[PDB]
Design a protein around this ligand. Sequence first.
Ligand SMILES: [Zn+2]
Ligand SMILES: [Zn+2]
Ligand SMILES: [Zn+2]
Ligand SMILES: [Zn+2]
Lengths: 374, 374
Amino acid sequence: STAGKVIKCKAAVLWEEKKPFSIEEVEVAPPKAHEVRIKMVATGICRSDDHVVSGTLVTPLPVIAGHEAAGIVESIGEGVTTVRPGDKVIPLFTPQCGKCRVCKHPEGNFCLKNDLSMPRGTMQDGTSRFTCRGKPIHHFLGTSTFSQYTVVDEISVAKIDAASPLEKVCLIGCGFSTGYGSAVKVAKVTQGSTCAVFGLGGVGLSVIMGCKAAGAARIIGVDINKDKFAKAKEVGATECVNPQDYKKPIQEVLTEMSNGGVDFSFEVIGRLDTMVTALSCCQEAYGVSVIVGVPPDSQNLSMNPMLLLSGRTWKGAIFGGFKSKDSVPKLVADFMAKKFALDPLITHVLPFEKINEGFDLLRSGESIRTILTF
Amino acid sequence: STAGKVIKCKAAVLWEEKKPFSIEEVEVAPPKAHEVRIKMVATGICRSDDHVVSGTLVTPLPVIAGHEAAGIVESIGEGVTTVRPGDKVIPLFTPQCGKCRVCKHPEGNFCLKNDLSMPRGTMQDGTSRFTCRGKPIHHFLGTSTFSQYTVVDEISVAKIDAASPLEKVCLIGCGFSTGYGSAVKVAKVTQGSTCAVFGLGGVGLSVIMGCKAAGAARIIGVDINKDKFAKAKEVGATECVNPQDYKKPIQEVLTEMSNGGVDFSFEVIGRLDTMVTALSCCQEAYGVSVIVGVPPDSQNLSMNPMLLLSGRTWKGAIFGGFKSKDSVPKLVADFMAKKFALDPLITHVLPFEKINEGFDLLRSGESIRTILTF
Ligand SMILES: [Zn+2]
Ligand SMILES: [Zn+2]
Ligand SMILES: [Zn+2]
Ligand SMILES: [Zn+2]
């Protein structure tokens, strides 16, 4: 029906930095070899999408952003074996080629085919599948989910359970997996341990979820906005701390609370000060601190290497350390097995055409997560 | 014969910062409960001992320094079970009490009974076993090995193989274990991996030894002094790099050499610049960088947390991450089993009374290691 031909549909185009998204009629070309064309069903609004708007995540413009989504396969290009028309799917902003030294490494997941390190804003073949009135439009992280239809490389898509609620599991595309994996995969939280989570937005709640899944005995949420405490406790926080409530530095408060430091700490916020606070507040001999995000325009931080010499470990990761094509279907199956809940993370749902209102919600701090529906 | 009574012997006392060691007649009290009096046989001169002299490692003065040594047990206090008179022993500057949360942790080794974090310069009981003309003299890290006789807490001494050459195995007391463990225990170097070692002094050579023991396929020594290259290759370096030979930054040279980053890097030097270089030069997705030492007066370093967000791990450790009382006898047995050589690390041997000449050798860079013999 549409296979093999151009699809005319709507997409949200960002023509220039620091502008609202423009809803436009675009033409989406059919998939070439080893490409997959997908009809979007739902897409989440992530901070990283806002970083494109601000000019802080530098990627070629004009662009179709969006990287956290789920949809249904409309058609497949020549030689595609891992998905078929009609399959439910989640685009992978961190690809899993299976061939490169990172994909072949037991602990690596940042596949060398990614479009994040040096963004080209294209398909793997160096071209674009999008045009708006004959003007080419860039891809974003090989996903481009702010469109009714997108085309992705086979290495950037994963087949998921056909019974999945796509309006919920789209979170596995970025925010949930990123926080959850940071606990379960990167830190490797252990049973009965004490965890501290700095930032109680959607990613921080996902870290709490992971700490709970791993059986942490204490999970201390830290945030200056006390209206985030209720949800943090719902999803597994055992106590919450507001640093503004105190006369002493937060790392001291946490060190005293945990009888000499936490087992695992997580910095979600992206703030250089809490990155060092989170490191300092873990036990000096065996503590592990994980950086879950860094704003793309971050300056250097200043820290004393003596924090590490005692035996601390400091690490970061993309996409929760998950090998993406392997892990996403497993995470969906975990959701389908009722291992964890996704509803507490969803605070707003809007039709796709209201994408700008959704970004206002993001920017004001009012939403944990907004899902856009097609 | 001497058991139960004061021993008059010689020791090297540091009366004040920035002075030569003074050879003095001291009185060494007999061991109280759970203490061990040891006749020294050999002691190494370590950079950390020099840091006491400079005032950069702050510990109470006057003091008997020295922490890297081997000797024979002269007598034991009440209730001592782990050593007996006549046993060969190595004092442990990082104690292993066996009871604290760190000693009970599978990956911790910086026992909470250490005298490093907040030095008191005493025995565990808050007193000193040393006097010089009735003036009390401080202990150092619960060891104080720059004396013909010392008294240590039972938790700070390990029994070793009775056939051990003490003039060699004293290196297991600090320098060798610190570098070797950093590779084998902290980094956990894997077979066929590529390693980069920044600094080719005694500790760096020990890291190379560990990388070799673990079966690294490539071990790249990095140092601006090219006269250290010969020994680095003898002990396992596959190539050596002098950053002064290059027009481009060293991390780029290493990244290009290792086809996109090393598996493991080690900063030995203690320099804030190479700490960040060593981190940067490991593979961005799965690289591990280990800080093996930090000068005790180090200022803050400046680094971009984006280095970690891709998947790097940064860690440090004391005493090579070894639980000390467990590991030291195993390391001696490994030496007695001819698993590794210690001779390449020993460049100078002097009688104890020539301790000041040995520190001149250390300060000039002329020695890899000097051993002082009694
Ligand atoms: Zn790959
Ligand atoms: Zn995202
Ligand atoms: Zn202990
Ligand atoms: Zn030492």
